[PDB]
Design a protein around this motif. Structure first.
Motif, PDB file in Angstrom:
ATOM      1  N   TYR A  88       0.929  -1.141  -0.086  1.00  0.00           N
ATOM      2  CA  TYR A  88      -0.020  -0.032   0.142  1.00  0.00           C
ATOM      3  C   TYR A  88       0.703   1.123   0.104  1.00  0.00           C
ATOM      4  CZ  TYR A  88      -4.178   2.910   1.438  1.00  0.00           C
ATOM      5  OH  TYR A  88      -5.038   4.085   1.734  1.00  0.00           O
ATOM      6  N   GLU A  89       0.530   2.293  -0.776  1.00  0.00           N
ATOM      7  CA  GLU A  89       1.054   3.502  -1.127  1.00  0.00           C
ATOM      8  C   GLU A  89       2.684   3.580  -1.449  1.00  0.00           C
ATOM      9  OE1 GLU A  89       0.094   6.300   2.111  1.00  0.00           O
ATOM     10  OE2 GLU A  89      -2.143   5.973   1.399  1.00  0.00           O
ATOM     11  N   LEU A  90       3.162   2.239  -1.734  1.00  0.00           N
ATOM     12  CA  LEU A  90       4.524   2.143  -2.387  1.00  0.00           C
ATOM     13  C   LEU A  90       5.370   2.029  -1.060  1.00  0.00           C
ATOM     14  CD1 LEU A  90       4.799   3.893  -5.728  1.00  0.00           C
ATOM     15  CD2 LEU A  90       3.751   1.700  -5.227  1.00  0.00           C
ATOM     16  N   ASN A  91       5.342   1.070  -0.222  1.00  0.00           N
ATOM     17  CA  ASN A  91       6.207   0.699   0.825  1.00  0.00           C
ATOM     18  C   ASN A  91       5.831  -0.601   1.544  1.00  0.00           C
ATOM     19  OD1 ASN A  91       4.019   1.341   3.298  1.00  0.00           O
ATOM     20  ND2 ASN A  91       3.745   3.242   2.084  1.00  0.00           N
ATOM     21  N   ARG A 138       5.706  -4.276   6.934  1.00  0.00           N
ATOM     22  CA  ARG A 138       4.763  -5.115   7.673  1.00  0.00           C
ATOM     23  C   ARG A 138       5.594  -6.550   7.406  1.00  0.00           C
ATOM     24  NH1 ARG A 138       1.279  -6.253  11.704  1.00  0.00           N
ATOM     25  NH2 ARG A 138       0.311  -8.439  11.026  1.00  0.00           N
ATOM     26  N   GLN A 139       6.653  -6.403   6.771  1.00  0.00           N
ATOM     27  CA  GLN A 139       7.589  -7.656   6.924  1.00  0.00           C
ATOM     28  C   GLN A 139       8.665  -7.388   7.961  1.00  0.00           C
ATOM     29  OE1 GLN A 139       8.086 -10.596   5.811  1.00  0.00           O
ATOM     30  NE2 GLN A 139       6.556 -11.008   4.039  1.00  0.00           N
ATOM     31  N   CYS A 140       8.630  -5.999   8.550  1.00  0.00           N
ATOM     32  CA  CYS A 140       9.231  -5.528   9.632  1.00  0.00           C
ATOM     33  C   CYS A 140       8.028  -4.629  10.105  1.00  0.00           C
ATOM     34  CB  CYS A 140      10.613  -4.738   9.477  1.00  0.00           C
ATOM     35  SG  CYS A 140      11.912  -5.925   9.011  1.00  0.00           S
ATOM     36  N   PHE A 141       7.227  -5.018  11.300  1.00  0.00           N
ATOM     37  CA  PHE A 141       6.267  -4.469  11.580  1.00  0.00           C
ATOM     38  C   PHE A 141       6.661  -3.173  11.971  1.00  0.00           C
ATOM     39  CE2 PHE A 141       4.839  -8.927  13.447  1.00  0.00           C
ATOM     40  CZ  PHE A 141       4.655  -9.376  12.235  1.00  0.00           C
ATOM     41  N   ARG A 142       5.397  -2.164  11.671  1.00  0.00           N
ATOM     42  CA  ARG A 142       5.791  -0.800  11.731  1.00  0.00           C
ATOM     43  C   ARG A 142       5.590  -0.169  13.265  1.00  0.00           C
ATOM     44  NH1 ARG A 142       1.798   3.469   8.232  1.00  0.00           N
ATOM     45  NH2 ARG A 142       0.434   2.501   9.640  1.00  0.00           N
ATOM     46  N   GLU A 143       5.118  -0.957  14.081  1.00  0.00           N
ATOM     47  CA  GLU A 143       5.052  -0.454  15.485  1.00  0.00           C
ATOM     48  C   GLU A 143       6.296  -0.546  15.891  1.00  0.00           C
ATOM     49  OE1 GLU A 143       2.448  -3.085  14.169  1.00  0.00           O
ATOM     50  OE2 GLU A 143       1.525  -0.913  14.005  1.00  0.00           O
ATOM     51  N   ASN A 144       7.282  -1.482  15.817  1.00  0.00           N
ATOM     52  CA  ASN A 144       8.545  -1.744  15.999  1.00  0.00           C
ATOM     53  C   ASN A 144       9.436  -0.932  15.116  1.00  0.00           C
ATOM     54  OD1 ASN A 144       7.411  -4.921  16.186  1.00  0.00           O
ATOM     55  ND2 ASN A 144       8.566  -4.248  17.973  1.00  0.00           N
ATOM     56  N   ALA A 145       9.189  -0.752  13.858  1.00  0.00           N
ATOM     57  CA  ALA A 145       9.835  -0.097  12.812  1.00  0.00           C
ATOM     58  C   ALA A 145       9.213   1.186  12.509  1.00  0.00           C
ATOM     59  CB  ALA A 145      10.179  -0.798  11.736  1.00  0.00           C
ATOM     60  N   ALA A 146       9.304   2.443  13.333  1.00  0.00           N
ATOM     61  CA  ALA A 146       8.519   3.378  12.998  1.00  0.00           C
ATOM     62  C   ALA A 146       9.878   4.616  12.583  1.00  0.00           C
ATOM     63  CB  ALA A 146       7.805   4.034  14.267  1.00  0.00           C
ATOM     64  N   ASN A 147       9.486   5.624  12.935  1.00  0.00           N
ATOM     65  CA  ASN A 147      10.089   6.909  12.171  1.00  0.00           C
ATOM     66  C   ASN A 147       9.881   6.896  10.759  1.00  0.00           C
ATOM     67  OD1 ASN A 147      12.412   5.899  14.907  1.00  0.00           O
ATOM     68  ND2 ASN A 147      11.245   8.276  14.698  1.00  0.00           N
ATOM     69  N   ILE A 148       8.606   6.858  10.272  1.00  0.00           N
ATOM     70  CA  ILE A 148       8.297   6.994   8.814  1.00  0.00           C
ATOM     71  C   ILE A 148       7.384   8.386   8.955  1.00  0.00           C
ATOM     72  CG2 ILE A 148       7.187   5.922   6.699  1.00  0.00           C
ATOM     73  CD1 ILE A 148       7.519   3.194   8.140  1.00  0.00           C
ATOM     74  N   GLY A 149       7.095   8.861   9.920  1.00  0.00           N
ATOM     75  CA  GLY A 149       6.388  10.070  10.362  1.00  0.00           C
ATOM     76  C   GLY A 149       4.849  10.067  10.680  1.00  0.00           C
ATOM     77  N   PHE A 150       4.432   8.850  10.694  1.00  0.00           N
ATOM     78  CA  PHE A 150       3.386   8.296  11.061  1.00  0.00           C
ATOM     79  C   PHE A 150       2.967   8.408  12.645  1.00  0.00           C
ATOM     80  CE2 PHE A 150       3.067   6.439   6.924  1.00  0.00           C
ATOM     81  CZ  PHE A 150       1.902   6.469   6.279  1.00  0.00           C
ATOM     82  N   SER A 151       1.821   9.007  12.875  1.00  0.00           N
ATOM     83  CA  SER A 151       1.306   8.999  14.401  1.00  0.00           C
ATOM     84  C   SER A 151      -0.096   8.396  14.702  1.00  0.00           C
ATOM     85  CB  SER A 151       1.611  10.228  14.967  1.00  0.00           C
ATOM     86  OG  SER A 151       0.882  11.599  14.311  1.00  0.00           O
ATOM     87  N   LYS A 152      -0.535   8.077  15.872  1.00  0.00           N
ATOM     88  CA  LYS A 152      -1.714   7.745  16.051  1.00  0.00           C
ATOM     89  C   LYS A 152      -2.178   8.553  17.156  1.00  0.00           C
ATOM     90  CE  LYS A 152      -4.976   4.111  17.630  1.00  0.00           C
ATOM     91  NZ  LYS A 152      -4.987   2.638  18.088  1.00  0.00           N
ATOM     92  N   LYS A 204       1.739  12.779  -1.891  1.00  0.00           N
ATOM     93  CA  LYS A 204       1.483  11.535  -1.154  1.00  0.00           C
ATOM     94  C   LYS A 204       2.867  10.959  -1.005  1.00  0.00           C
ATOM     95  CE  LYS A 204      -1.530   9.964  -4.325  1.00  0.00           C
ATOM     96  NZ  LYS A 204      -2.692   9.094  -4.495  1.00  0.00           N
ATOM     97  N   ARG A 205       3.659  10.843  -2.011  1.00  0.00           N
ATOM     98  CA  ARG A 205       4.882  10.142  -2.208  1.00  0.00           C
ATOM     99  C   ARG A 205       6.144  10.597  -1.607  1.00  0.00           C
ATOM    100  NH1 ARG A 205       1.050   6.654  -3.315  1.00  0.00           N
ATOM    101  NH2 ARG A 205       0.618   5.869  -5.390  1.00  0.00           N
ATOM    102  N   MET A 206       6.180  11.869  -1.578  1.00  0.00           N
ATOM    103  CA  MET A 206       7.258  12.835  -1.113  1.00  0.00           C
ATOM    104  C   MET A 206       7.582  12.305   0.318  1.00  0.00           C
ATOM    105  SD  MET A 206       6.897  16.486  -3.141  1.00  0.00           S
ATOM    106  CE  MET A 206       7.723  16.525  -4.473  1.00  0.00           C
ATOM    107  N   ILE A 207       6.481  12.630   1.246  1.00  0.00           N
ATOM    108  CA  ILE A 207       6.381  12.508   2.573  1.00  0.00           C
ATOM    109  C   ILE A 207       6.469  11.131   3.008  1.00  0.00           C
ATOM    110  CG2 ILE A 207       5.019  12.468   4.420  1.00  0.00           C
ATOM    111  CD1 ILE A 207       3.282  14.520   2.929  1.00  0.00           C
ATOM    112  N   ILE A 208       6.315   9.990   2.121  1.00  0.00           N
ATOM    113  CA  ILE A 208       6.487   8.575   2.335  1.00  0.00           C
ATOM    114  C   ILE A 208       7.987   8.319   2.387  1.00  0.00           C
ATOM    115  CG2 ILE A 208       6.051   6.421   2.018  1.00  0.00           C
ATOM    116  CD1 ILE A 208       3.502   7.198   0.965  1.00  0.00           C
ATOM    117  N   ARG A 209       8.518   8.913   1.254  1.00  0.00           N
ATOM    118  CA  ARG A 209      10.123   8.568   0.876  1.00  0.00           C
ATOM    119  C   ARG A 209      11.155   9.164   1.944  1.00  0.00           C
ATOM    120  NH1 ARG A 209       8.499   8.619  -5.870  1.00  0.00           N
ATOM    121  NH2 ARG A 209       8.036   6.487  -6.082  1.00  0.00           N
ATOM    122  N   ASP A 210      10.559  10.396   2.342  1.00  0.00           N
ATOM    123  CA  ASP A 210      11.229  11.076   3.309  1.00  0.00           C
ATOM    124  C   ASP A 210      11.427  10.241   4.533  1.00  0.00           C
ATOM    125  OD1 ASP A 210      12.685  13.668   4.046  1.00  0.00           O
ATOM    126  OD2 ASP A 210      11.175  13.676   5.573  1.00  0.00           O
TER     127      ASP A 210
END
Lengths: 140, 99, 190, 38, 200, 310, 140
Positions: D16-19, D22-36, E2-8
RNA sequence: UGCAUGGCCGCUUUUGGUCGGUGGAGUGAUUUGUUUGGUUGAUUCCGUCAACGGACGAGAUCCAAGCUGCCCAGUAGGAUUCAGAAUUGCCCAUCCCUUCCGCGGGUUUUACCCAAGGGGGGGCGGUAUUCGCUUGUAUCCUUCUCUGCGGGAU
RNA sequence: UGUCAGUGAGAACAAGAAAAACGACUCUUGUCGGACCUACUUGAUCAAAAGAGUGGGAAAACCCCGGAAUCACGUAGACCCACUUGGGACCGAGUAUUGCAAUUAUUGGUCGCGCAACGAGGAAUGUCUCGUAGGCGCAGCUCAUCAAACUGUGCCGAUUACGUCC
């Protein structure tokens, strides 16, 4: 635009041009009438009027909505998948009429694939709907 | 034609330092400034199972990003645009455009 | 003018109507609206359900058992027909017949389980005003669904039948028999 | 498909969205900028 | 986009992970990067900046070179700097590393943790916590807590203030876990949720 | 009493009637439900169960409560101080907005008009005393740094021989300012609590300033010196002067009283009702003298405006 | 003489354009009021205008553009934007007295007028479908 | 091998619970604080007492929704005229009415109703539609939109 | 099945969210377009499935950014109290589409079988008090290809109770 929904477009803009069009022939009657008009029938195409509830209405849609055709015009097409394979029912359309209905407009009340009026014959001839029914209307 | 500046960023308070502050330099100083209100802000929502095994209560998460697209418009700078886009350096994912 | 102060269903008048019982008069209210179709918030508080007529309440609780059932607007289509039917049968305003039927089909006394000792015990327990209303409605409009379930040929007409026979106290109606049999236990045992 | 931050190809691949995370779970492997937060 | 942020996100992840492993016990806080237009500064937060650079200069250009060879970057589009973080106490990850070192040296759990606690709470920190689970016995998987000052886990606001580190130590018999938290005395939202003050 | 205006859905904070306006007989009053009402005296036969007049227009829509309203001198406009950012000159002909004056980030406390239709003066919780023109350009903003606190009320001097503006404070001052140079003129002091309101009598030589203490300091604006004080004996909610007399007749939280420089005490004391604080808890939040100056309309905590005669 | 107001209920916004008339029968979209296909919704939209003078104060030309929810909620929104438009007209061009009369009688007659009825929707949450009825139980 | 183990997740527990210093009591294990009452979802409060002064959870800070100010326009959408298509509905109903007023008829009276004229308002044409492209030709705006930052009660 | 009700037609009308880029070609003194969708027209002088060309988009641009189900309908539609014209599940024949490879993978398709089940269904047992329950549809997700699943948005939208502790 002008056509449809100025006379009650649902049932009192239909029967009157229908009578007139069958009384003196105009629109297509091409073979393919028997074939499926609406998705997943278990019956024939209809009890009567296989492709004579269609043609002026299929002009009307494209008229007032300006150049909806072949994929947009099935927008005001139908299909419910009213019999189904025991899964959740989904919408569809049958392309059969699309071809024929984009042909149509080059004659009779419309001009072209860019301009969809002439004098807008249907409107003018439909001004006598209100005056007098031809079906013994309830509201007249 | 007319040059526009869209600034796309993950975060607020990076883009803020761009638009408000550093457009003052282009406000009537060398070109004229037509401010609209910035474009709708997308979410990228992702749903991830918390549990690394089949025994939990089958729990999930909701993770979200903000995508801030800050649009302000100018009236035909040419060669002046070099100044405009050299002004922010203050955060990563600050990208600017010229028509 | 002529729809400012005047209030109709569309030909049925609310001047004629009188509340049949004096037990009920704050849980039976008169209609003024031209359809019983709902759009408000109808509950939030213990009594806020008795600010509105029996008509509206009835039409909402008319049927359930969804499968693609058309809910409210569909119900209103049947209301219209059933009012015309009741009108020519009683030779009187249909609304006022509804007013009567809701009151006279209602159980007015009950008896309940409330005992203990591994055993039950029954006592005469009076039915509260709002309950008379509600219970009557539900029973009448339960009857309807059962009547057309595989049976009759009638679509609205069964409703009209029930509402008539209820107002007469006749034991054809599904509501009447319930009032009867319950009171034969609740006034034969205290 | 196949994954590029493991070679497992099983224990489920996110594309999903080209990443992949989830073969290394994102809870452990964060700092992708996502937050809950909700 | 969309893709910028992800790749960063991807770039930061890879970078951060590479350093946090292979360059360690320098008081590594982390990294931060930002663009200067067709060049990326990529500062490296360390307590000891000398190891980052190298005294032969090999380290800094090795780390530039690894990034270049992966991502197809070139010189003048990529750069690496050092930054002096004063007070190793206020960096979770940094304290974590020093603690890890004590434990791998086979020093007592108690004594070790007390070092961290002393250091942190001297610089004026609100509180700290060191939760070391793992072996210390056998035969348990015993968990030991050490809790100091005060710390909040309420709201979502806590997450901003309190930075955290989890690391492993690898010893005979197997793994030992280590965790360090440390609630900063200085907010990173400039916000508190307690104490209404009155300005007199 | 002699008719009442009973149409409000919220507190009458400030009542305003013609005293610098000679156009029509219209009153304008501030509802506290986020509306402004523009009345007029229209029909009165001076009976209790009949009204003193009818609402002319209702000027509607705000984010917050209105503070005070002032009639335009001959403009037929109603300028409003508002606890929202907007400050609107409105119209009473069409009942809708003329122009929005936005200079404020913290909201307007008091507005009034110069005796000639010319300047608008906007106080605020900014601590900025602003001279706007009526066009909707801000012409100047006064300060020497004199304001350290909110501008409680502002009243132009009816003498324009030297252009003056008489501002209150919550810094416990009354600051007169020369408008032209933005210069602080002689501070008038000794108020022991914040100013409630500041009014100037029609001659422009005498200024009645109040405080929350419940005393009114009478001030020479001519000399920058002080006259004999009038002591209400209760906190002052409004202080005013008659157009045709020098009668103060201050409002207090016990009612309206009849004060003047002749006695400096009650002639009669007009209570709004008997058993006030064992009933509806009424206080008189404002007092608006009529154009006649022999009638005094009192605003209230309650949702009524009552007529009171001398 | 003009005013423009809006209705809002659910996700349907209505836009009521008022343009000065002293006659004109009130209509909606491209289809006027006697040709509105759902009789029930037609009746709803009528009670707006009918009550508080049938055509005694309802004489302004009011046409609408309503989009954003299903047919039913659009009809609700219609009523709102109509009555809003009447009120606002009688505010600006006419005294508060007339407005007070009209308005008070609207407020009385069960719509309320003033309320957007702004009860929207639920989120879907967890690990769960809608608001709780779960999957269905495991034994406990 | 999860009964060698790290991390993570589930549950105990969706409730209001938890712990230490100094002092008091007991040989000790322990207890007091954390307690009779009322209130609240709440160890939430007020009061009282060998406890005194504290720390977490709770509350609050956050995220989204509802109403609103300010920002506010070229891909958000309306307003007027110019514009021509088109309609200008008399083939079963919308040239005919409403309001105010005056007089004469059909009424024994009442109810009811007929005729004529004066004043007043526009209605079908002085308000005419809708085109979401006729993307044509003119003019103007921010109600409908949008996002950031603020208003709004226990 | 008569409270979409079963086969036919026509009308009005919805919201998040997804999408793009291959060292593969061409381009130069340092490099551009093809694996995403949707528009339009041929696909009817004769079906569906399905072929192909032109056209725009990195998305508030994608043609009106948003539409056909629940719903509305007396157009004087058809069926009509039946295991049927209510339901599908088995079963045979044909064809096209997808793919590195199909072995009903394909399945949005034709047309057989339906007169195969089943008529609201024993004991038992589940969960929600409001825009909720219930009813309905769409998209995302996974990914040669398929969603009765899961996640999110929207539409139609109640009855009873607002009490006690058994």
């Amino acid at each position: 635009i002008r056509r449809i929904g100025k006379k009650k477009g649902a049932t009192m803009k239909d029967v009157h041009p229908w009578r007139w069009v069958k009384l003196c022939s105009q629109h297509f009657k091409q073979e393919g009438k028997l074939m499926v008009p609406n998705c997943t029938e278990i019956v024939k195409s209809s009890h009567g009027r296989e492709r004579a509830p269609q043609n002026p209405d299929w002009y009307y849609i494209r008229c007032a909505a300006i150049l909806r055709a072949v994929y947009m015009r099935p927008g005001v097409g139908y299909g419910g998948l009213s019999k189904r394979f025991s899964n959740k029912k989904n919408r569809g359309s049958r392309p059969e009429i699309t071809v024929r209905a984009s042909k149509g407009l080059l004659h009779w009340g419309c001009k072209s694939l860019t301009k969809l009026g002439l004098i807008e014959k249907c409107e003018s001839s439909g001004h006598r709907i209100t005056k007098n029914g031809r079906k013994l209307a309830d509201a007249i | 034609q007319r040059v526009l500046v869209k600034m796309t960023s993950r975060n607020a308070k990076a883009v803020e330092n761009v638009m408000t502050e550093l457009l003052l330099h282009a406000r009537n100083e060398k070109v004229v400034l037509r401010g609209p209100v910035r474009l709708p802000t997308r979410t990228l929502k992702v749903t991830t199972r918390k549990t690394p095994c089949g025994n939990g209560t089958n729990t999930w998460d909701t993770y979200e990003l903000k995508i801030y697209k800050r649009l302000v418009e100018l009236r035909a700078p040419t060669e002046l645009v070099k100044k405009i886009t050299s002004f922010p350096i203050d955060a990563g994912v600050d990208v600017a455009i010229t028509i | 003018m002529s729809a400012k102060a005047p209030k109709l269903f569309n030909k049925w008048s609310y001047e004629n109507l009188q509340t049949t019982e004096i037990a009920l008069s704050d849980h039976i209210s008169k209609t003024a609206t031209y359809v019983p179709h709902s759009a408000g918030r109808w509950q939030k508080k213990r009594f806020r359900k008795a600010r509105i007529p029996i008509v509206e309440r009835l039409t909402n609780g008319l049927m359930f058992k969804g499968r693609g059932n058309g809910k409210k607007l569909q119900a209103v289509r049947l209301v219209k027909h059933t009012l015309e039917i009741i009108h020519l049968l009683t030779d009187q305003n249909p609304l006022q017949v509804v007013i009567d039927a809701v009151s006279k089909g209602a159980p007015r006394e009950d008896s309940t389980r409330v005992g203990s000792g591994g055993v039950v015990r029954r006592q005469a327990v009076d039915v509260s005003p709002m309950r008379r209303v509600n219970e009557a409605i539900y029973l009448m409009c339960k009857g309807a669904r059962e009547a057309a379930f595989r049976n009759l040929k009638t679509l609205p007409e069964c409703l009209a039948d029930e509402i008539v026979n209820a107002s007469k106290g006749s034991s054809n109606s599904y509501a009447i028999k319930k009032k009867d049999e319950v009171e034969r236990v609740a006034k034969a045992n205290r | 498909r196949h994954c590029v931050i493991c070679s497992n190809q099983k224990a489920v691949i996110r594309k999903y969205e080209l990443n992949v995370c989830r073969q290394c779970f994102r809870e452990n492997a964060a700092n992708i900028g996502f937050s809950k937060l909700r | 986009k969309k893709r910028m942020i992800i790749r960063d996100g991807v770039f930061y992840a890879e970078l951060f992970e590479f350093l946090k492993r292979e360059l360690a016990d320098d008081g590594f806080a982390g990294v931060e990067h930002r663009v200067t237009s067709t060049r990326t500064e990529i500062v490296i937060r360390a307590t000891k900046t000398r190891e980052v650079l190298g005294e032969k200069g090999r380290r800094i250009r090795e780390l530039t070179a690894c990034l270049q060879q992966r991502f197809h970057y070139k010189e003048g589009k990529l750069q690496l700097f050092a930054e002096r973080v004063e007070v190793r106490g206020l960096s979770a990850m940094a304290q974590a590393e020093s603690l890890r070192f004590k434990l791998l040296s086979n020093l007592q759990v108690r004594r070790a943790a007390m070092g961290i606690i002393r250091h942190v709470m001297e610089s004026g920190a609100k509180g700290c916590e060191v939760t070391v689970g793992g072996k210390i016995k056998g035969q348990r998987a015993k968990s030991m807590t050490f809790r100091d000052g005060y710390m909040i886990k309420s709201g979502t606001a806590h997450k901003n203030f309190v930075d955290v580190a989890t690391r492993h130590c690898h010893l005979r018999a197997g793994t030992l876990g280590v965790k360090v938290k440390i609630m900063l005395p200085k907010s990173m939202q400039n916000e508190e949720e307690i104490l209404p003050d009155v300005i007199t | 009493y002699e008719g009442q205006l009973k149409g409000h859905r919220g507190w009458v904070t400030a009542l305003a009637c013609p005293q610098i306006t000679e156009t029509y007989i219209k009153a304008v009053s501030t509802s506290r439900d986020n509306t402004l009402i523009a009345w007029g005296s229209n029909m009165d036969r001076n009976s209790e169960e009949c009204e003193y007049g009818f609402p002319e227009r209702r000027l509607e829509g705000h984010s917050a409560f209105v503070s005070d309203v002032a009639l335009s001198n001959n403009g037929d406009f109603a300028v409003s101080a508002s606890w929202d950012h907007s400050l609107r000159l409105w119209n009473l002909q069409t009942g809708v907005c003329q122009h929005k004056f936005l200079g404020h980030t913290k909201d307007v406390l008091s507005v009034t008009f110069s005796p000639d239709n010319r300047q608008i003066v906007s106080g605020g919780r900014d601590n900025a005393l602003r001279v706007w023109n009526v066009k909707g350009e801000c012409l100047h903003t006064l300060g020497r740094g004199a304001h350290t606190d909110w501008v409680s009320c502002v009243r132009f001097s009816p003498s324009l021989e030297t252009p003056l503006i008489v501002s209150g404070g919550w810094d416990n001052l009354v600051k007169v300012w020369d408008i032209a140079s933005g210069r602080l003129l002689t501070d008038l002091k000794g108020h022991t609590n914040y100013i409630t309101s500041v009014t100037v009598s029609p001659d422009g030589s005498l200024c009645a300033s109040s405080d929350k203490d419940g005393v009114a300091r009478l001030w020479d604006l001519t000399k920058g010196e002080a006259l004999s004080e009038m002591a209400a004996g209760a906190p002052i909610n409004q202080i005013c002067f008659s157009p045709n007399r020098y009668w103060m007749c201050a409002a207090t939280e016990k009612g309206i009283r009849i004060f003047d420089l002749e006695n400096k005490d009650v002639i009669v004391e007009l209570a709004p009702e008997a058993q006030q604080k064992s009933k509806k808890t009424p206080e008189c939040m404002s007092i608006a003298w009529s154009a006649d100056g022999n009638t005094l309309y009192s605003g209230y905590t309650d949702n009524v405006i009552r007529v009171w005669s001398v | 003489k003009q005013v423009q107001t809006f209705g809002k209920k659910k996700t349907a916004i209505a836009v009521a354009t008022v343009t000065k008339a002293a006659q004109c029968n009130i209509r909606v979209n491209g289809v006027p009021v006697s040709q509105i296909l759902p009789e029930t919704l037609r009746a709803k939209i009528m009670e707006a205008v009918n009550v508080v003078g049938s055509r005694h104060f309802a004489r302004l030309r009011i046409d609408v553009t309503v989009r954003g929810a299903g047919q039913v909620a659009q009809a609700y929104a219609t009523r709102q934007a109509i009555a809003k438009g009447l009120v606002a007209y009688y505010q600006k061009y006419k005294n508060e007295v007339e407005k007070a009369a009209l308005k008070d009688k609207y407020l009385a007659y069960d719509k309320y007028l003033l309320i957007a009825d702004p009860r929207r929707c639920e989120p879907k949450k967890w690990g769960r479908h809608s608001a709780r009825t779960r999957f269905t139980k495991s034994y406990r």
